[PDB]
């Protein structure tokens, strides 16, 4: 369609699946291969990534330009990257990705939004929605065009260090929060077939329906263990969300470092060519874990000649090698040129990542906008993680005994109040992993509020509020508090480093809530990513909260706890008695729990 020097590809008015023909029609081995290489910002270079064809970087859990990097920081890394991607001889953009799991969490001053957990609590699936909304500006703030999000495990057991990223151990709250996904993307059209990848534009960001598949029903909960249970099981638990996410066209599938039956999941041909790809008709990207190829073998890393057939011929699209490019482009290259891997198969891994760059606009914007800086951090985005941190708490307790007044809602005005705990000031732990650093971390990491801030903000101008990390019994029976506020929790984890077999927390913790309930009527909030040993938190508090890993905005606690809205969050999980009863889900025959999913106390807005 003229002009002189036209090329097909190119021409934004022509369908996605002509201009995917066209690109790929043109492309050498070697601009192949490059597509379906994902690498480390650690490793790039504007020529590694020309050089190399790269057609994907990303940052992994804390791999940031630096600390305290500002949103336009972020744009000119990217950009950066990104030039020299567009300066190669087909000039294909490369796509960009990282952990937005709630909110842009590896960025300093983003808002940061409940854990999934938390938000299966809130049963508000609208709620989801406008948080992947959110979500995806702060994203684009940074010049970033694909989030590794949601998480659609089914934490079948909380022992499992990523049970808090499982919005539920029921499969249909799982299914009801995979609006997360039109959120991040935008809404797909009408006509729209099921399997087919959507983002709207540059204001959306590609999406990941992760980790494919059974992530959250290893044996133990042990993390990238294996998950043994029959077709049927594994259908009707850990599949169907992913169902629900190809009707919302998602852009793309991240497979587990799990083992369904002792089969490796990155090797398992079936179920990711058989299943997801022929049945479910899924015609986005499938991408690998970090380093996912490699952890087929014992030990890791051991043959990754076999690694790279394995997963390639078992219809993985792009590989998140991401640290060994050169190793890995030049193995999966002698592989094709031996014939071993067939050029129909690199060529459908190609169209499919192709098919999601052009679909989502990326070759009519490669670059960031930089008017999206200011979405970064937004106050509208933190005003709506202030609700959903709110809709996330579960009221387990109010009044000791049937008997006794109701503790909560607290007054806002008392001549003189007590907040306490190891998590009462604290952003880092109430916000979890994740955050900022991979692990995430302790103390003052981002922008927010912490519990003792929020309820200074909240309280009446001649309330004193006093703040003390662990004081004894008797500081508490001499202070003249009218009730006292105590945070205490877990610590904040990710991936294999939170599984755990014991899920007690962290002293001090409960003598602390001892302590301060021994000598005033007192709150606990319990900051936690899943269930934790609870009865001896119980005896001792008047009310009990269980807030999950609220974020950032430690007001949605307050509004809660002083009554300017009613306890409305429901379990999303089942509160287990004994972690030898572990596991024990709804629905089971064995079912005895101290608090049922479902389970959640109200109280009324003052
Ligand atoms: C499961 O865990 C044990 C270590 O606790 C390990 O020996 C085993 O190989 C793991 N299985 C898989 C499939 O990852
Ligand atoms: C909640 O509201 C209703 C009034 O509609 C009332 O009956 C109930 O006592 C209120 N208070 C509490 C603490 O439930
Ligand atoms: O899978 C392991 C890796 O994944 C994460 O995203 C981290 O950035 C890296 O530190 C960690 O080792
Ligand atoms: O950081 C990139 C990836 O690495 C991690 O190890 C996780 O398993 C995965 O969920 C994440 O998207």
């Known amino acids: ?163 808090y990223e499982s919005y539920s151990e029921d499969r249909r709250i799982v299914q009801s929060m995979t609006e997360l996904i039109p959120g991040l993307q935008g809404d797909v059209p009408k006509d729209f077939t099921s399997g087919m990848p959507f983002v709207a534009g540059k204001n959306k960001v590609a ?35 992913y169902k629900n996410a190809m009707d919302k066209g998602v852009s793309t599938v991240m497979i587990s470092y799990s083992s369904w039956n002792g089969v490796k999941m990155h090797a398992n041909q079936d179920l990711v060519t058989g299943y997801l790809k022929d049945t479910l008709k899924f015609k986005g990207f ?49 592989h094709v040129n031996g014939g071993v891997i067939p050029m129909s198969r690199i060529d459908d891994a190609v169209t499919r990542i192709l098919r999601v760059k052009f679909t989502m606009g990326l070759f009519e914007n490669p670059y960031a906008d930089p008017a999206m800086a200011e979405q970064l951090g937004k106050q509208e985005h933190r005003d709506l993680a202030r609700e959903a941190a709110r809709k996330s708490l579960v009221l387990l307790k109010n009044g000791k005994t049937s008997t006794d007044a109701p503790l909560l809602p607290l007054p806002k005005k008392a001549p003189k109040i007590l907040v306490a705990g190891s998590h009462a000031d604290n952003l880092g732990y109430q916000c979890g992993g994740w955050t900022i650093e991979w692990q995430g971390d302790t103390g003052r990491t981002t922008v927010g509020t912490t519990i003792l801030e929020a309820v200074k903000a909240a309280v009446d101008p001649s309330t004193v509020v006093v703040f003390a990390e662990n004081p004894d019994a008797e500081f508490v029976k001499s202070g003249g508090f009218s009730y006292a506020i105590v945070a205490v929790g877990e610590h904040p984890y990710t991936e294999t480093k939170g599984d755990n077999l014991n899920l007690t927390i962290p002293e001090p913790g409960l003598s602390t809530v001892q302590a301060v309930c021994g000598g005033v009527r007192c709150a606990t909030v319990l900051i936690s990513g899943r269930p934790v040993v609870v009865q001896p938190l119980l005896a001792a508090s008047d009310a009990l909260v269980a807030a999950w890993l ?57």
């Open 1 to 163: 369609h003229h002009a002189a020097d036209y090329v097909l590809y190119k021409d934004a008015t022509k369908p996605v699946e002509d201009r995917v023909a066209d690109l790929l029609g043109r492309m050498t081995l070697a601009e192949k291969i490059g597509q379906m290489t994902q690498i480390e910002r650690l490793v790039a270079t504007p020529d590694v990534l020309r050089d190399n064809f790269i057609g994907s970087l990303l940052s992994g859990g804390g791999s940031v330009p630096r600390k305290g990097a500002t949103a336009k920081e972020w744009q000119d890394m990217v950009d950066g990257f990104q030039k020299a991607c567009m300066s190669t001889r087909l000039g294909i953009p490369m796509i960009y990705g990282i952990d937005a799991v709630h909110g842009q969490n590896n960025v300093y001053g983003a808002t940061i939004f409940p854990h999934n957990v938390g938000l299966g609590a809130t049963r508000d699936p609208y709620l989801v929605k406008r948080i992947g909304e959110a979500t995806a500006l702060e994203v684009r703030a940074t010049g970033i065009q694909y989030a590794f999000a949601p998480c659609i495990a089914v934490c079948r057991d909380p022992r499992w260090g990523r049970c």
């Open 207 to 241: 999406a990941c329906a992760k980790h494919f598949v059974g992530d959250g029903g290893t044996v133990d909960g042990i993390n990238e263990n294996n998950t043994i249970i029959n077709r049927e099981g594994l259908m009707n638990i850990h599949m169907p969300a």
């Open 286 to 334: 499938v991408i690998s874990d970090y380093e996912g190829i490699d952890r087929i073998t014992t030990p890791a890393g051991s043959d990754y000649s076999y690694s790279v057939k394995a997963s390639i011929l078992a219809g993985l699209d792009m590989i998140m090698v991401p640290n060994k490019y050169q190793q890995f482009i030049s193995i999966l290259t002698g």
């Open 550 to 606: 609220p974020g950032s905005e430690g007001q949605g606690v307050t509004d809660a706890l002083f009554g300017d809205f009613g306890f409305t969050g429901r379990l999303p999980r089942t509160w287990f008695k004994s972690v030898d009863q572990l596991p024990m889900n709804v629905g089971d025959a064995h079912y005895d729990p101290l608090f049922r999913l479902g389970y959640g106390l109200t109280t009324n807005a003052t």
